[PDB]
Design a protein around this motif. Structure first.
Motif, PDB file in Angstrom:
ATOM      1  N   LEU A  48     -66.572   1.393 -40.102  1.00  0.00           N
ATOM      2  CA  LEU A  48     -66.042   1.379 -41.649  1.00  0.00           C
ATOM      3  C   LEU A  48     -65.086   0.461 -41.919  1.00  0.00           C
ATOM      4  N   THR A  49     -64.513  -0.134 -40.970  1.00  0.00           N
ATOM      5  CA  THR A  49     -63.206  -1.353 -40.963  1.00  0.00           C
ATOM      6  C   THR A  49     -63.329  -2.387 -41.868  1.00  0.00           C
ATOM      7  N   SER A  50     -64.584  -2.593 -42.723  1.00  0.00           N
ATOM      8  CA  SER A  50     -64.809  -3.195 -44.152  1.00  0.00           C
ATOM      9  C   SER A  50     -64.113  -2.562 -45.305  1.00  0.00           C
ATOM     10  N   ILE A  51     -63.430  -1.240 -44.920  1.00  0.00           N
ATOM     11  CA  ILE A  51     -62.810  -0.491 -45.870  1.00  0.00           C
ATOM     12  C   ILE A  51     -62.032   0.457 -45.200  1.00  0.00           C
ATOM     13  N   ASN A  52     -61.090  -0.295 -44.357  1.00  0.00           N
ATOM     14  CA  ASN A  52     -59.512   0.124 -43.782  1.00  0.00           C
ATOM     15  C   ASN A  52     -59.005   1.062 -44.784  1.00  0.00           C
ATOM     16  N   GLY A  53     -58.928   0.559 -46.250  1.00  0.00           N
ATOM     17  CA  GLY A  53     -58.343   1.304 -47.155  1.00  0.00           C
ATOM     18  C   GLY A  53     -58.851   2.496 -47.689  1.00  0.00           C
ATOM     19  N   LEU A  54     -58.338   3.547 -47.416  1.00  0.00           N
ATOM     20  CA  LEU A  54     -58.527   5.104 -47.798  1.00  0.00           C
ATOM     21  C   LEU A  54     -57.427   6.026 -47.539  1.00  0.00           C
ATOM     22  N   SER A  55     -56.253   5.664 -48.156  1.00  0.00           N
ATOM     23  CA  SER A  55     -55.011   6.728 -47.951  1.00  0.00           C
ATOM     24  C   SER A  55     -55.311   8.126 -48.471  1.00  0.00           C
ATOM     25  N   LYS A  56     -56.341   8.173 -49.541  1.00  0.00           N
ATOM     26  CA  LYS A  56     -56.980   9.422 -50.006  1.00  0.00           C
ATOM     27  C   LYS A  56     -58.379   9.692 -49.264  1.00  0.00           C
ATOM     28  N   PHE A  57     -58.820  10.790 -49.038  1.00  0.00           N
ATOM     29  CA  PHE A  57     -60.154  11.352 -48.460  1.00  0.00           C
ATOM     30  C   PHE A  57     -60.491  12.559 -49.241  1.00  0.00           C
ATOM     31  N   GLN A  58     -61.976  12.576 -49.829  1.00  0.00           N
ATOM     32  CA  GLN A  58     -62.605  13.716 -50.460  1.00  0.00           C
ATOM     33  C   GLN A  58     -63.827  13.765 -49.628  1.00  0.00           C
ATOM     34  N   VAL A  59     -64.043  15.121 -49.217  1.00  0.00           N
ATOM     35  CA  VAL A  59     -65.180  15.809 -48.762  1.00  0.00           C
ATOM     36  C   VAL A  59     -65.714  16.864 -49.300  1.00  0.00           C
ATOM     37  N   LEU A  60     -67.302  16.629 -49.890  1.00  0.00           N
ATOM     38  CA  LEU A  60     -67.719  17.537 -50.825  1.00  0.00           C
ATOM     39  C   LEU A  60     -69.290  17.822 -50.467  1.00  0.00           C
ATOM     40  N   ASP A  84     -58.393   1.428 -62.178  1.00  0.00           N
ATOM     41  CA  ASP A  84     -58.954   0.274 -62.835  1.00  0.00           C
ATOM     42  C   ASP A  84     -57.746  -0.963 -63.359  1.00  0.00           C
ATOM     43  N   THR A  85     -57.021  -0.975 -62.251  1.00  0.00           N
ATOM     44  CA  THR A  85     -55.943  -1.805 -62.463  1.00  0.00           C
ATOM     45  C   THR A  85     -56.389  -3.455 -62.460  1.00  0.00           C
ATOM     46  N   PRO A  86     -55.414  -4.257 -62.486  1.00  0.00           N
ATOM     47  CA  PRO A  86     -55.924  -5.754 -62.411  1.00  0.00           C
ATOM     48  C   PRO A  86     -56.108  -6.338 -60.783  1.00  0.00           C
ATOM     49  N   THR A  87     -56.235  -5.301 -59.922  1.00  0.00           N
ATOM     50  CA  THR A  87     -56.698  -5.351 -58.567  1.00  0.00           C
ATOM     51  C   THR A  87     -57.565  -4.395 -58.017  1.00  0.00           C
ATOM     52  N   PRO A  88     -58.968  -4.344 -58.013  1.00  0.00           N
ATOM     53  CA  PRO A  88     -59.633  -3.255 -57.133  1.00  0.00           C
ATOM     54  C   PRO A  88     -59.112  -3.264 -55.727  1.00  0.00           C
ATOM     55  N   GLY A  89     -58.927  -2.043 -55.510  1.00  0.00           N
ATOM     56  CA  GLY A  89     -58.372  -1.733 -53.809  1.00  0.00           C
ATOM     57  C   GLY A  89     -59.702  -1.620 -53.126  1.00  0.00           C
ATOM     58  N   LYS A  90     -59.941  -0.414 -52.664  1.00  0.00           N
ATOM     59  CA  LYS A  90     -61.143  -0.076 -51.532  1.00  0.00           C
ATOM     60  C   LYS A  90     -61.587   1.105 -51.662  1.00  0.00           C
ATOM     61  N   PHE A  91     -62.969   1.334 -51.484  1.00  0.00           N
ATOM     62  CA  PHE A  91     -63.783   2.591 -52.009  1.00  0.00           C
ATOM     63  C   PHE A  91     -64.988   2.450 -51.216  1.00  0.00           C
ATOM     64  N   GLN A  92     -65.500   3.646 -50.958  1.00  0.00           N
ATOM     65  CA  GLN A  92     -66.829   3.878 -50.435  1.00  0.00           C
ATOM     66  C   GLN A  92     -67.418   5.324 -50.515  1.00  0.00           C
ATOM     67  N   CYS A  96     -69.416  12.282 -48.362  1.00  0.00           N
ATOM     68  CA  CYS A  96     -67.958  11.957 -48.265  1.00  0.00           C
ATOM     69  C   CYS A  96     -67.506  10.803 -49.360  1.00  0.00           C
ATOM     70  N   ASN A  97     -66.402  10.804 -49.729  1.00  0.00           N
ATOM     71  CA  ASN A  97     -65.902   9.749 -50.775  1.00  0.00           C
ATOM     72  C   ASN A  97     -64.471   9.346 -50.536  1.00  0.00           C
ATOM     73  N   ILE A  98     -64.065   8.196 -50.135  1.00  0.00           N
ATOM     74  CA  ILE A  98     -62.820   7.440 -49.778  1.00  0.00           C
ATOM     75  C   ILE A  98     -62.228   6.596 -50.532  1.00  0.00           C
ATOM     76  N   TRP A  99     -60.865   6.706 -51.004  1.00  0.00           N
ATOM     77  CA  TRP A  99     -60.395   5.910 -51.886  1.00  0.00           C
ATOM     78  C   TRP A  99     -58.830   5.529 -51.401  1.00  0.00           C
ATOM     79  N   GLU A 100     -58.748   4.065 -51.364  1.00  0.00           N
ATOM     80  CA  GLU A 100     -57.512   3.424 -50.917  1.00  0.00           C
ATOM     81  C   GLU A 100     -56.235   3.851 -51.399  1.00  0.00           C
ATOM     82  N   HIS A 101     -55.883   3.663 -52.505  1.00  0.00           N
ATOM     83  CA  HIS A 101     -54.740   4.209 -53.245  1.00  0.00           C
ATOM     84  C   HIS A 101     -55.056   4.585 -54.683  1.00  0.00           C
TER      85      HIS A 101
END
Ligand SMILES: [Ca+2]
Ligand SMILES: [Ca+2]
Ligand SMILES: [Ca+2]
Length: 212
Positions: free
Chosen positions: A79-91, A60-68, A51-56
């Motif tokens: 995984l609440t360390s990375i609550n930020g994941l409005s997109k989800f990828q399952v591979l 590579d903006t001037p603020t890194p969001g949240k990713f795992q 799995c690959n999770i991506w905040e928004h």
């Protein structure tokens, strides 16, 4: 139990609250204007899927969001360390990472009659017609990630005149630093008649600005 070939996600630590299941090789977005986008607490990721999770999907903006990058063959009780994941990828274990691609008309005011076909380095070639939803382009084990994978882009009208609209090459590159995909396109390989804009991290939107 979790299948080694699938993944599952539950709205409570130690697998409680609510339940959810996801097949290999799928992409979803779980958000409602920044609040209940999370909808996770305990998940299991089979020994032959990642799995690959991506905040928004930060570019590579001037603020890194949240990713795992949920390690292939593990269980995560929180995984609440990375609550930020409005997109989800399952591979699957067959596909290391995958990229959202889409086609948009900027000249051919017809749609569907315009079909684009992309094939990276000896991969399952994918064809999509302008008007379908975003296509997913999976990429197999690409080590080192910072290598440049050679790829071919060809686009042809499915209706007369049905000549090759453009035929050229493109280059994709990956960065595990923030699970970013980046595309390299030069006038020596890519045409001057289509361009592709980086709409989000790992999301590429090809626009046709010259039918020639
Ligand atoms: Ca969010
Ligand atoms: Ca990034
Ligand atoms: Ca949470």
């Amino acid at each position: 139990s979790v299948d080694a070939n699938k993944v599952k996600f539950f709205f409570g630590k130690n697998c409680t609250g609510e339940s959810f299941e996801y097949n290999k090789g799928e992409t979803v977005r779980f958000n409602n204007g920044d609040k209940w986008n999370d909808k996770f607490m305990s998940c299991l990721v089979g020994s032959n899927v990642r799995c690959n999770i991506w905040e928004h999907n930060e570019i590579d903006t001037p603020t890194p969001g949240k990713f795992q990058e949920l390690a292939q063959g593990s269980t995560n009780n929180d995984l609440t360390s990375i609550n930020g994941l409005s997109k989800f990828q399952v591979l699957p274990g067959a596909f290391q990472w995958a990229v959202d691609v889409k086609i948009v008309n900027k000249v051919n005011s017809t749609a569907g009659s315009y079909e684009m076909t992309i094939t990276p380095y000896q991969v399952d070639k994918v064809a999509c017609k302008d008007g379908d939803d975003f296509v997913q382009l999976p990429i197999p084990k690409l080590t080192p990630p910072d290598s440049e994978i050679v790829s071919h882009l060809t686009v042809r009208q499915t209706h007369t005149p049905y000549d090759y609209v453009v035929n050229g090459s493109v280059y994709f590159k990956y960065s595990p630093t923030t699970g970013q995909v980046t595309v390299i396109k030069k006038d020596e390989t890519f045409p001057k008649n289509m361009t592709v804009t980086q709409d989000d991290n790992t999301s590429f939107i090809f626009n046709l600005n010259s039918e020639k």
